[PDB]
């Protein structure tokens, strides 16, 4: 579905710090509880020297925000990642690697805008608004600088 | 893909403790490492009063047996329920709700042979190659009876 790639895309660039200021997603349930499926917060981006993305996130799960480790494993082209399921691909739409980074996951369809620090980027979320037009999304959130300072955005 | 369940199903007996006796996946990398995405290791079944099923598991995930607890929504067909996912269906293929249990899960494809106790089940195991007879499995494991005591089968 998603045709916005970031050209050019130096992995290695993308690691440290991030904040998921905004999240959209194809289907309301993806995102509509702490505990839906793609309400996910991104902590930390580790590419491997092989080229290999450890994601770190926080998700809600039973109670708790819980803190996870992903690896999306890098492809033949440089901003699509795969993660191993029951086959989920992460795409780099855009990245200027100082203060944004826009990716979507898709198998049905969630994307954010990632921000380096925990204030709001109007700049990130009109090109993350712009990205989405083109896409079939049914549900938006957005955080504010407080939530962003907490774990799982509370 | 999946056209065997359990007829005359009642949920509410299948209540307590499982073993993981025997597993069997559609791709090789869904069951191959411990960290494989469907290498999940049942515990105990919860059916709720509502008919909802409760699942406690065991898997490996970052370098330790973690405890999960999955939630599968009932549907219209007493054999089938639904796990919310970036759409996974459980569906019960036989019980004696006192002995073994066969279940799939699909999407790609998994089964296990579930069994009330650390023993092998000869009986259960037959059953289970019969119902994976008609389906395109390419990896099959079983666990014997010290393993299946251990926390994510060691
Ligand atoms: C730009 C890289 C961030 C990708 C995060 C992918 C999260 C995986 C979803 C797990 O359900
Ligand atoms: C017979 C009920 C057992 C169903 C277990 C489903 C496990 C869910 C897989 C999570 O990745």
Same mark, same amino acid.
């Given at each position: 579905? $998603? /045709?916005? %790639? #970031?050209? &050019?895309?130096?992995?290695? *660039?993308?690691? &440290? ?5 905004? #999240? ?15 309400? $996910?917060?991104?902590? =930390?981006?580790?590419? /491997?020297?092989? &080229? ?15 803190? *996870? ?25 855009? %990245? ?18 990632? $921000?380096? %620090?925990?204030? $709001?980027?109007? =700049? ?5 608004? *712009? ?14 600088? /407080? ?8």
């Amino acid at each position: 579905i $998603v /045709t916005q %790639t #970031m050209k &050019g895309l130096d992995i290695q *660039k993308v690691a &440290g710090t991030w904040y998921s200021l905004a #999240m959209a997603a194809s289907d309301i349930s993806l995102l509509d509880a702490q505990s839906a499926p793609l309400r $996910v917060y991104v902590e =930390e981006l580790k590419p /491997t020297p092989e &080229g290999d993305l450890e994601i770190l996130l926080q998700k809600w799960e039973n109670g708790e925000c819980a803190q *996870k480790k992903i690896i999306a494993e890098k492809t033949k082209i440089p901003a699509v990642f795969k993660i191993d399921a029951l086959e989920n691909k992460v795409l780099v739409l855009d %990245t200027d690697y100082k203060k944004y980074l826009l990716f979507c996951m898709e198998n049905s369809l969630a994307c954010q805008c990632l $921000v380096r %620090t925990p204030e $709001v980027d109007d =700049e990130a979320l009109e090109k993350f608004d *712009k990205a989405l037009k083109a896409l079939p999304m049914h549900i938006r959130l957005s955080f504010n600088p /407080t939530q962003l300072e907490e774990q799982c955005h509370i």
